[PDB]
Amino acid sequence: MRILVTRIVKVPEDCTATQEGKIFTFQGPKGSIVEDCTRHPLTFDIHEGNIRIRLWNGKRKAMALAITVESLLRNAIKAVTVGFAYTMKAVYNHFSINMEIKEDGKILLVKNFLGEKNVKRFRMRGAARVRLDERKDTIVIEGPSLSDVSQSAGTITNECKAKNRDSRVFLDGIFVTERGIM
Amino acid sequence: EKKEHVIIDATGQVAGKLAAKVAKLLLEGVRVTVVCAEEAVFVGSLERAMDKFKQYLNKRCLVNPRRGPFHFREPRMHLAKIIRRMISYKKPRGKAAMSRLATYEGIPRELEGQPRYKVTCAFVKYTGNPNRYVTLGKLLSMFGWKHAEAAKSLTDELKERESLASLQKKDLDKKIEELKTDKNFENEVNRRLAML
């Protein structure tokens, strides 16, 4: 324990923060973000243009919460300045996996996939667009948010899995291979 | 013989701590109406409150369910039943005390400019779990209550037209103030004061 603990989050040149009662609003040269913090028992303010977080007489579960809230704010800052971009790759043994884009990178269709007549359809989470890279069979997902880019990729991996057969032999699916920058 | 009346507002009030005090007023001959009955709270998590309401629904006379216990899903009817079971209501002194109670979701139209009170010990911020609670309206909407959006509407329209009435009243307090500080005003009133 301690009597006081303090954390600092640096705000770079382009980002411009704003605070309306525990609610933080960022705006960089890639979009906006609203990072709400009304439910946490900690103190917020902007000191020398930076974010400051304080905690008085916290035990160990409140100290673990103060460090996780600090690292969600630096994720929201680098979303509206550099962005996020994930890259996925489809692999197979016998049946080619055909992929299509329906809206402006809002829907992703997945054809044959192990001889299926069914057509899987995925909808990207808010403020994320799906694109098509040019290696040979690769897609890219981009947007000004880590929450939506990583949840859209994790759904696609979780839903292509070859039910009821040995997973050591039927190794087909779509995996993440590069977590990068816009 | 008594003729006193009290309007009680339940917005951040623990539901059990308010019911025990409202029932002691009814027994001592006071008329009570509780408004905004859907905004009372239960300390804890929503998973703990749904498990307790689910065991309540299980109680049921197997021989004939029409005789059986009756499970009310409206916030005004459910909170009235918590006050009733604070007291001995089968006896005639308890029947009279239940005649002095009224309950509402939102605020009805007739009680528009009259003052409301809160109970000093039922504020949720005096417990050790401030910011972990469920309102009575969110819990009951998950078992059948339909009119949760029509209750928030009716309350805000009355709040706004109860705030305008305060602006008209405050400005007259300034126009009357300057008249009391006048010249022909005082020399008049000093004459009425002159004839005791």
Partner: protein, 178 residues
């Protein structure tokens, strides 16, 4: 400011006792012992002094003599310092040792404060504890981190508990009772 319940006068007291075996004509003028005891009650202090002699020597209360019993009074001027308290205590299954520093305004106020903390953390009454010694620790022989941090000057912190500023049953709807 008043508190309305007096918290500045402790419940514990201190006594300095001289004792002996009861003289005979086969053993006239026996040996004299002395010690201090923390407890309530002049009467409680004498019985505990004889349970001490009976377990090391074999002198019992029915064959013993109390020669002197003095109560040490509280200090007149109040000031916060650091203390250290040796003691043993009885459990569901045995007897144990402990050390436990703290801050107080006297030796008997410091024992009341240590008992007050063993009642929530280990669930002991007060009769399951025996005090071996109490003394003042200067500033740099401190063994615990909690006392080193509060013993500093220029300490500062806000408080987050609420306050009841009225003793009515019903308050107007927009009043903020804290």
């Amino acid at each position: 400011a008043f508190s309305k319940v007096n918290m500045t006068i402790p419940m514990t007291k201190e006594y300095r006792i001289h004792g002996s075996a009861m003289p005979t004509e086969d053993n006239p003028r026996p040996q004299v012992f002395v010690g201090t005891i923390f407890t309530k009650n002049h009467v409680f202090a004498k019985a505990k002094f004889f349970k001490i002699l009976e377990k090391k020597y074999k002198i019992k209360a029915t064959k013993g003599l109390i020669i002197d019993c003095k109560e040490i009074p509280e200090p007149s001027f109040k000031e916060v310092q650091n203390y250290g308290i040796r003691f043993v205590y009885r459990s569901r299954s045995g007897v144990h040792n402990a050390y436990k520093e703290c801050r107080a305004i006297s030796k008997c106020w410091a024992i009341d404060h240590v008992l007050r903390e063993l009642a929530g953390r280990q669930k002991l009454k007060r009769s399951a504890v025996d005090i071996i010694s109490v003394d003042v620790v200067p500033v740099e022989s401190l063994k615990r981190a909690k006392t080193i941090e509060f013993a500093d000057e220029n300490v500062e912190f806000p408080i987050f508990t609420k306050i009841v500023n009225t003793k009515s049953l019903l308050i107007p709807s927009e009043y903020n009772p804290s």
